[PDB]
């Protein structure tokens, strides 16, 4: 049931007045949130795509990245919209009123922010963001203030991903680097792309499957560390899956094994790859050639191509989370577009 492939034609079309930047999914109801280049934050419903549920203008500049999470205390939804107005915003969804409820705005960045993430490990919600300030920043959602600011790269980081206490960060200086969350020490550095990193994310655990070559751990060290394989997307028209090495387990970097290893490379895109989202055996990725491609982990070949999905650039993709048991991986996936349109595939 995890091997679903969307059909060729779009299910329905969502009309936006300006360029769509970041699209997210509501993990409980069929609700999609659509960004704008003008800064307006939308919330479309998949069944009735006629009018938005809540069109809120939050920033005078463009917004770049989003994250959405339904919390699990020991509950509600949090939407964060990183923007180009030197600050980020945090929103709370009200199901009864069907309108956006603002919570707070976190400050501190000295340039525009391009990435944002939110998660929980043990009854504490944290928000990360990364900007053109060359520094990775962290926040506490309940407290509201930062915990650790540090620069991993000479140039400016672009995208991030996280689980537990480990953060990797793609950068404009075409290098990847794991950044440890409490200590702030770089365990390993990576090289091999020829262009800045657009998006990059982890590949996580799954319980039961017939055969796996890119998610399952190999040894007991991989098994208890839990961080094995990562995939990076960069402007050199290539997508690569990267082996991360072991630390000297605050963990210490390995002097002879502090370098990443590219395992499998994927190519065939006609422009820059923009965003990736792994879902079981299938690596869904976009590009700037008006197309979205579907890549397999095992054979390393694109099974399906969606040519001319839009008339312009395709900006961002996002799926439902599948490596956790809290949120089921529903068969829904929605794309963005530079040509003021958004398309969702269902069933």
Partner 1 sequence: KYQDLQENQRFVNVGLEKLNESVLKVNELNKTLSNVQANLDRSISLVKSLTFEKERWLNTTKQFSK
Q: Which is nearer to partner 1, 85 or 322 (CB)?
A: 85
220 binds, among partner 1, a second copy, none (CB under 5 to 8 A by kind): none
Q: Which is nearer to a second copy, 17 or 257 (CB)?
A: 17
Least distance from C-beta 60 to partner 1, angstroms? 5
Least distance from C-beta 76 to partner 1, angstroms? 22
Least distance from C-beta 99 to partner 1, angstroms? 14
User: The tokens 């890549």 sit on which residue?
Assistant: 295
Least distance from C-beta 295 to a second copy, angstroms? 33
Per the document, the length of the chain is 347
Q: Which is nearer to a second copy, 52 or 251 (CB)?
A: 52
The alpha-carbon radius of gyration of the chain (Å, integer) is 19
Tell me which DSSP letter residue 221 carries: H
**CA-to-CA separations, 191 to 171, 185, 196, 234, in angstroms, rounded:** 11, 18, 11, 12
Interface with partner 1 (CB under 8 A), residue total 5
Q: Which is nearer to partner 1, 34 or 178 (CB)?
A: 34
User: The tokens 């280049």 sit on which residue?
Assistant: 37
Q: Which is nearer to partner 1, 39 or 336 (CB)?
A: 39
Return all residues near 207 (Cβ < 8 A) that are at least 6 apart: none
Interface residue with partner 1 among 8, 15, 28, 57 (CB under 8 A) is 57
Residue 69 phi/psi, 5-degree rounding, is: -155, 135
CB-CB neighbours of 347 under 10 Å: 8
Least distance from C-beta 157 to a second copy, angstroms? 28
Q: Which residues bind a second copy (CB under 8 A)?
A: 15-19, 26, 28-31, 37-38, 45, 51-52, 55, 95-96, 98, 340
Least distance from C-beta 33 to partner 1, angstroms? 19
19 binds, among partner 1, a second copy, none (CB under 5 to 8 A by kind): a second copy
141-157: b or e for each residue (b if 16 or more CB lie within 10 Å)? beeeeeeeeeebbeebb
Task: Let me know if 201 is exposed, middle or buried by CB neighbors in 10 A (0-12, 13-18, 19+).
Answer: buried
Least distance from C-beta 231 to partner 1, angstroms? 54
Can residue 38 be called a binding residue for partner 1 (CB under 8 A)? yes
Cβ 202 vs Cβ 175: under 8 Å: no
183 binds, among partner 1, a second copy, none (CB under 5 to 8 A by kind): none
Q: Bridge-partner residues for 101, per DSSP?
A: 92
Can residue 148 be called a binding residue for partner 1 (CB under 8 A)? no
51 is written with which tokens? Answer: 């009018």
CA distance 86 to 171: 19
Return all residues near 4 (Cβ < 8 A) that are at least 6 apart: 331
CA distance 42 to 115: 19
Interface residue with partner 1 among 8, 60, 191, 248 (CB under 8 A) is 60
Can residue 28 be called a binding residue for partner 1 (CB under 8 A)? no
Q: Which is nearer to partner 1, 102 or 191 (CB)?
A: 102
Can residue 86 be called a binding residue for partner 1 (CB under 8 A)? no
29 binds, among a second copy, partner 1, none (CB under 5 to 8 A by kind): a second copy
Q: Which is nearer to a second copy, 16 or 112 (CB)?
A: 16
Can residue 61 be called a binding residue for partner 1 (CB under 8 A)? yes
Least distance from C-beta 292 to a second copy, angstroms? 23
CB-CB neighbours of 338 under 10 Å: 18
Return all residues near 139 (Cβ < 8 A) that are at least 6 apart: 106, 126, 127, 128, 129, 145, 146, 147
The C-alpha angle with vertex 77 and arms to 294 and 207, in degrees rounded to 5, equals 50
61 binds, among a second copy, partner 1, none (CB under 5 to 8 A by kind): partner 1
Contacts with partner 1, residue ranges (CB under 8 A): 38-39, 57, 60-61
């Amino acid at each position: 049931v995890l091997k679903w492939i969307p059909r060729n034609l779009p299910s329905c079309l969502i009309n936006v007045e300006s360029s769509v930047t970041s699209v997210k999914l509501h993990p409980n109801l069929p609700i999609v949130f659509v960004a704008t280049d003008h800064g307006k934050l939308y919330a479309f419903d998949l069944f009735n795509y006629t009018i938005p549920l809540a069109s809120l203008q939050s920033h005078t500049k463009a917004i770049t990245s989003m994250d959405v999470l339904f919390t699990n205390y020991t509950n509600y939804l949090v939407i964060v919209t990183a923007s180009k107005d030197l600050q980020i915003h945090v929103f709370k969804w009200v199901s009864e009123e069907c309108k956006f409820q603002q919570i707070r705005s976190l400050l501190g960045h000295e340039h525009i922010v391009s990435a944002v993430k939110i998660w929980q490990k043990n009854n504490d919600v944290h928000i990360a963001s990364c900007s053109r300030d060359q520094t990775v920043k962290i926040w506490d959602f309940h407290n509201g203030w930062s915990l650790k600011t540090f620069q991993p790269h000479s140039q400016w980081v672009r995208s991030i991903d996280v689980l537990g206490d480990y953060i990797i960060s793609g950068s404009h200086d075409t290098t990847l680097r794991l950044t440890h969350w409490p200590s702030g020490n770089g365990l390993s550095v990576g090289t091999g792309h020829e262009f800045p990193i657009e998006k990059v994310k982890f590949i996580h655990f799954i319980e039961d499957s017939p055969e796996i070559r890119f998610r399952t751990p190999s040894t007991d060290r991989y098994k208890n560390w839990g961080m094995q394989y990562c995939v990076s997307a960069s402007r050199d028209r290539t997508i690569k899956i990267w082996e991360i090495p072991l630390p000297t387990l605050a963990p210490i970097p390995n002097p002879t094994d502090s370098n990443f290893r590219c395992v499998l490379t994927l190519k065939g895109h006609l422009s820059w790859v923009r965003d990736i989202s792994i879902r079981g055996q299938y690596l869904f990725s976009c590009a700037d050639d008006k197309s979205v491609r579907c890549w397999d982990l095992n054979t390393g070949q694109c099974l399906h191509v969606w040519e001319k999905l839009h008339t312009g650039f395709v900006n961002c993709l996002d799926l439902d989370v599948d490596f956790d048991s809290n949120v089921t991986p529903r068969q829904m996936m929605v794309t963005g577009g530079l040509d003021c349109k958004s398309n969702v595939f269902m069933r």
